[PDB]
Amino acid sequence: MKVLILACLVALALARELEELNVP
Amino acid sequence: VLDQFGRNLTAAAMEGKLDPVIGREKEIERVMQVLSRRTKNNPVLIGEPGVGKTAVVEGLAQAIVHGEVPETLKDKQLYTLDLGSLVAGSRYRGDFEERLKKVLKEINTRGDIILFIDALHTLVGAGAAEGAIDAASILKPKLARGELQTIGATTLDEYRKYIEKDAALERRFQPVQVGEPTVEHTIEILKGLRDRYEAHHRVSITDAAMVAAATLADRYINDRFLPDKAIDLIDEAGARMRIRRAEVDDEQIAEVLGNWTGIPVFKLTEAETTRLLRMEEELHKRIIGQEDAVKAVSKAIRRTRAGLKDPKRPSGSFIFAGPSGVGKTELSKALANFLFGDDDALIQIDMGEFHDRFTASRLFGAPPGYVGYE
Amino acid sequence: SLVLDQFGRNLTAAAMEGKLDPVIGREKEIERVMQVLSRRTKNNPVLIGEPGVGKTAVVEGLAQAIVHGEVPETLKDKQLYTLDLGSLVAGSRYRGDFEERLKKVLKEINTRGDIILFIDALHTLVGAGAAEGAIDAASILKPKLARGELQTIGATTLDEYRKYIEKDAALERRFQPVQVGEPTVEHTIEILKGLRDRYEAHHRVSITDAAMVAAATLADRYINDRFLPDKAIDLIDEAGARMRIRRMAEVDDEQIAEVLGNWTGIPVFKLTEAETTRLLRMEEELHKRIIGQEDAVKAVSKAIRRTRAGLKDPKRPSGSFIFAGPSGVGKTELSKALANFLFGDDDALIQIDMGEFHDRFTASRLFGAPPGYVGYEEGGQLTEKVRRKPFSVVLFDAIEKAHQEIYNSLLQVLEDGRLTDGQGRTVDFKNTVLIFTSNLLGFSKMKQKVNDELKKHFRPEFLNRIDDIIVFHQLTREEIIRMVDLMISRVAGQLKSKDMALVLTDAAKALLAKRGFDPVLGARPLRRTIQREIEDQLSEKILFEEVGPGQVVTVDAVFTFT
Amino acid sequence: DRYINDRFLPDKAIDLIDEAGARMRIRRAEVDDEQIAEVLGNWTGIPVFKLTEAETTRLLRMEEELHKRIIGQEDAVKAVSKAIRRTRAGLKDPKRPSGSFIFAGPSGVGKTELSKALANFLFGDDDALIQIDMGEFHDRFTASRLFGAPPGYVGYEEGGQLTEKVRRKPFSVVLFDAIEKAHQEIYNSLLQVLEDGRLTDGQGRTVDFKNTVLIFTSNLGTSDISKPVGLGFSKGGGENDYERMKQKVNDELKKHFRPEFLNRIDDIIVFHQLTREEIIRMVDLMISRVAGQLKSKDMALVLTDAAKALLAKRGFDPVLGARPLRRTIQREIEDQLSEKILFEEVGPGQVVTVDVDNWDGEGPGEDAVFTFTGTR
Amino acid sequence: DRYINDRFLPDKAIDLIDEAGARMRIRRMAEVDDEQIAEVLGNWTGIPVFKLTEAETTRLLRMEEELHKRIIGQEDAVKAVSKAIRRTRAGLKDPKRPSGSFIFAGPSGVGKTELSKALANFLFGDDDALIQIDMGEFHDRFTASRLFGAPPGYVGYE
Amino acid sequence: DRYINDRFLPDKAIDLIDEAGARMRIRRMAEVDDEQIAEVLGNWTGIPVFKLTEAETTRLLRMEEELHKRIIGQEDAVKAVSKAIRRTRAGLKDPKRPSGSFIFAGPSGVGKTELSKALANFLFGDDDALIQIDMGEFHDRFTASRLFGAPPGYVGYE
């Protein structure tokens, strides 16, 4: 009779640090 | 706060740009009561979308510039803060935190800033998540000390999902209930907003229209809320007057409302009394034959709507007995299209599939933990 | 240092300037975190506690202890910096920025050597500066936290400690959990007595001693979502800020209890002499709504007067009642009358229809699903309706229709005022009025008859916890005559709205009584045969417009209407 | 190793050495086993420290301190006093909880009440009791409210309502109020709790219950208490009262609980019905709650021995005990004071002497009255 | 290949050869035989596969007696778990099956859990080395994800 | 087209032509045939589609006899998995449907898993080449995410 509602964990991460290209 | 993520509502009230805020004065006094506290002087305007939560703050920002503030809120430059625009542009680490610390540094230097954060439920997990550097955890130290005055504005659902659920954020914020206005309160709002929408549209708006805007939006619109829904009727009727041209009336509001729901202006601009006077002849249009049934339910609705009615009874309860499909649910559809102007008001439950009391927990909802909950 | 100024706030310099609130009390735990900071290895206290209990304040009380020299010699002349992790993430955009700002901060702490670091919201240390390939703030501090070469105070909610710190088990043994408990009432009093200078100066009010005793006593008793220090400070600040708007001033305990009355909705305020007169004449104001039934109207009035006298047990609800009796005699109508007396609204009555709890699997509608299950986060009708309104009248309509295991959920409701929901949040029922309405010979010579039917049906410990079991009279015929006077006044109320009167005769009121009184039900049928045999035949005569304003409708179905 | 299941041996033990050495740096020094146990006592909350003479005498008169809150119930108060004494003498099994009790007996004789008195003894607070109300666990599927949801479900991050309350306070009194009202599967989750001192939560953290006092109050087996004889023919007609009750409760606990649950309980105490001399003392315990609230408004509630005796006559049910006495004081004292405070017949700054103006000095009382005369 | 399933044949086997050769170049200040491979595998998986010391062989033959230092009576089950361990240390257990699968049934209190703790202290010196999954906390089907974990895309998958 | 579902027609087929011409030019150091393409597809997908060698043709003739070296009896079941493998290697199964689909049912312990391991030991030389998906740990509604994977964005999708 019962239903278990589980819990779909989503993949959530902080924004990526980037590495820069230099122009002198 | 810069004029980059928000807007100075105090300077908007200096130049007469904020709309007049009629009523809601128990709430503006309650917001001043929170903002005058020493610690955690942070009200949350809890309401529904369009009940006038921003208008309480617009009314507060008017009360600051008119000197009606209790020498704790005097000369407070109240800024909004679009957290949506503050998150927008964060694709790299530290973008959001930098734009928020610049705002927070600007409030620290000036010391006379009241934040208005519309959609304060966005504050939870604005940067990443609850346990992460988000906008909540950045502001939580200064909100707990009264050093950052912030007026929030959530709905009742969003306050319960995000601020009450977040431990160590429910304390920082003080709930200020902004309820939906009544119809008579909304007419007082519209009469206060009369000079704004008459001057904008260059179209005279009458008292008949503003009573019609507040009454018919409460009846015919039920996904939105009074203050806004009724202002939108006044605003759209004055706009559609400009595409016809000098005067917005009762019938002009019913036209621009009929274009939203699909009710014919007639069924909007009517009068219950006449509205149900030629009820029989309009219910014959899809029921021909079995005429004593139509005249019985037309008499019954005209008894149990017109004149006297207790508010502790439905508009009519009926047992339709007899042979199937001879006009049983055909009359109820014909009554529904008469009801307020929409045929899409008939709901068949089809109780033939039910031969169980356990399926009554699959008709009125399940107990939580069981099937039939959605 | 100037690196620590842009990524931190010096609380030691803030305590020199007197910008931190005095921490009066909490000396046993400032002593505790000075022990942890004095350690050789792992000299890092995390202050775990509920939201409000003063976790940030203890560190502010430590910073005031450093500037006063009340610390040991190994803590003297320490500059305590509230490290802003958000400011360190700020200004990073690029790979290695946040790591460089941390190494610059840790270089300054190593160079000066007099820095106590304070990471408020230590749960935000995991995932701080985390990104495309970024060493997070936690992984950089962990070699220094483990060896005692960085003295970092943390402060975390107990919820945020189990969710975020304990999920990084290498970081939870970098820190010593210092329990920052919520204070007692007498400790909260002494906090308020020490914070009275900051709040009398901010609001320019004069906060009396009984106001601060009442702010701590009434907050522990009537506020159950916040924590002792705050909840009581909240009553002091909102009272001083309400008096700030009144002068647009002395803050007594009646100013505190008025603020609590506006905020929890629990009438706790000092009694108005007109409100006491309302409570003393409660029965005859409840007799305006309901006719007869005196041994209940006298008995629910004793419960409310016991609450407003401050004489109820604070560990039990305001009133617990079996409204036992025959059908239709006003079991629900008194519960609505009591809800109108206390709120002015029938819809303030929390009516729990116990008929639809007929099986034993619907009890999660009361208290929510357990974890795992559907409606775990939206769980509990009865718990959430009283978490929002603690002072309520909760009606359990037709209590015998429910399964007998639904009562066992409500046992500690009656005795302890507790109903822990499925989420685990205990909901305060200590201010509710719990009402259980229940529809449930020979040669010789109703209260004895009904009370034995309760002892047969209900559990002996359920009836043991009911404060008053009230058997209801079947309404006599002359009490039906006084009810038809009451039920035409709804019709006559909205007829005087049209300026027309409705005067009945003795034959009309008797004929309604003969058609309304049943041995089966009673009065319920009377409500029907007035709105079907008076109100319907008036409504169509308004439709016919043979009546009008300035008319009287005498009445003698077979009723006459002029 | 014994009193921590959060951390690991090298550090956990270094933390005790290092913080006791740092606590002595505040004092000045020698770090002995006493100062280690004081650090561990301040950290875990578990009292393992050397008993002072002010507390050694207090544990010896533990029954006398619990009898300030519990009237009668001698074998009940002795049993939980022996549990705390063998815990603080260092004689308990370190693999098992401090005490596992079934408080059984009739309604209103002090089952839930001794659990609050024991938590008030050990902590100074009735609210330090972890009161798990087992009546709302009659559904079989509410066992996850004890340990949490398993992986993949909601309430997996909020894992445990019982496991988390004892992760905070490993030394606590955990009350399982009305254990017979739970499903059979609920106390089967508590079998590891009673014998091994373990309850692994939803996330997989085993919580030490080895320092808890587990109390299972129970109304089970008391339905003949309203009857003086049985249905059958009997040889005797004396006072096997309680006696048959202790037999009937033990029979009905064996029927309702699996024998391995009752095997793991340290003591099943069947409680006495409250006698008449205990209801007389229960009046003083229940007037003092009302008198304590009048002192909040500066009123002294003084009852004479005539009024205290009449409350004991009016409020003596042998079947229930002390809840009809509470309801008697509610109806006869509190409700009449709730009038007279609101009328200003009695008021703040007055002593309210409660007398009886009608009656004999030992009669039953059917026409008697309480008179509330205000003085000062 | 038998005692590892986290690594892959070429490497894991080279791991045993390289580390046994590296253990022997520590002992010589020299020959790597199969006993030195099994010492390295026993140090690394924790599985005793090495050649049996005569003191340990005596301890395994005197297993029923040394489990009776903690288990009074119950000699049917003390010898049953002793036959399982001796079958493992003789290398006569089925490599596809576990070392022994037992249902200790009977009445309450007679030493079913205590023999499991006595067997764990025999094999490890600590009865807290017993992996004790108390099955009373499994009350409905959905707690099986405590044993093997959450499936992908649910909380506690990691 | 038939034996790839991860690549696209133009190259997938130029992959077979080019690598067969490359396998052929290692042999002359000159005709790429039908059979030379299927040898390359056999090396690359791992699917035996190539023409059966004489040692392997008679091995499928005696396959029921070779499965009976590892399973005793169960002749109706060894034949029915023999009818299925020999349909596949005769290029003769329906290519819209798996090569064999079987319910092995019956009493516990009579060789249902043993035949599946023997069939995998036939076709691959090792019974750990059996993809053994033990369905008893899938009695939850949502452990189907272990079979097909999490949807994208939910943890463990990758």
Ligand SMILES: Nc1ncnc2c1ncn2[C@@H]1O[C@H](COP(=O)(O)OP(=O)(O)OP(=O)(O)O)[C@@H](O)[C@H]1O
């Ligand atoms: N011992 C104390 N003495 C004086 N004031 C105190 C004390 N403890 C707490 N307070 C006051 O209580 C209020 C809340 O304290 P604080 O914000 O430090 O709590 P917290 O537990 O850190 O909160 P959160 O976890 O939500 O950040 C502040 O006004 C603080 O000054």
Ligand SMILES: Nc1ncnc2c1ncn2[C@@H]1O[C@H](COP(=O)(O)OP(=O)(O)OP(=O)(O)O)[C@@H](O)[C@H]1O
């Ligand atoms: N004493 C009364 N005074 C006023 N109205 C009453 C009274 N008794 C019954 N009524 C009328 O009864 C109707 C409501 O039913 P009521 O709440 O009395 O039912 P009840 O006594 O709870 O019985 P049941 O449990 O069978 O519904 C209303 O019409 C109400 O006016």
Ligand SMILES: Nc1ncnc2c1ncn2[C@@H]1O[C@H](COP(=O)(O)OP(=O)(O)OP(=O)(O)O)[C@@H](O)[C@H]1O
């Ligand atoms: N032996 C006792 N000593 C002191 N007070 C008691 C005693 N028995 C009952 N009381 C009083 O009676 C009230 C109910 O007590 P308690 O909850 O212990 O009864 P109970 O036996 O637990 O009830 P039930 O068994 O039905 O749950 C309490 O307020 C308590 O003050």
Ligand SMILES: Nc1ncnc2c1ncn2[C@@H]1O[C@H](COP(=O)(O)OP(=O)(O)OP(=O)(O)O)[C@@H](O)[C@H]1O
């Ligand atoms: N055969 C035994 N030899 C030694 N001690 C024993 C024996 N049986 C029981 N004990 C002692 O009694 C305690 C409880 O017994 P144990 O839990 O091992 O029994 P059990 O049969 O597993 O019980 P249950 O089935 O109820 O879990 C043990 O920890 C030990 O102290």
Ligand SMILES: Nc1ncnc2c1ncn2[C@@H]1O[C@H](COP(=O)(O)OP(=O)(O)OP(=O)(O)O)[C@@H](O)[C@H]1O
């Ligand atoms: N027909 C058989 N031929 C050879 N060995 C067999 C046979 N049946 C069982 N065995 C032996 O018994 C072991 C276990 O039996 P197996 O698992 O194959 O039986 P099953 O019927 O598939 O099992 P279950 O019915 O429990 O799912 C096999 O690995 C093998 O050693």
Ligand SMILES: Nc1ncnc2c1ncn2[C@@H]1O[C@H](COP(=O)(O)OP(=O)(O)O)[C@@H](O)[C@H]1O
């Ligand atoms: N009391 C009021 N007086 C005048 N206009 C009001 C009032 N309350 C709401 N309004 C108007 O109705 C609309 C409500 O929107 P807004 O103020 O943003 O509230 P919310 O945030 O609840 O949607 C706006 O056009 C606002 O100006």
Ligand SMILES: [Mg+2]
């Ligand atoms: Mg804080």
Ligand SMILES: [Mg+2]
């Ligand atoms: Mg009713």
Ligand SMILES: [Mg+2]
């Ligand atoms: Mg066992």
Ligand SMILES: [Mg+2]
């Ligand atoms: Mg098998």
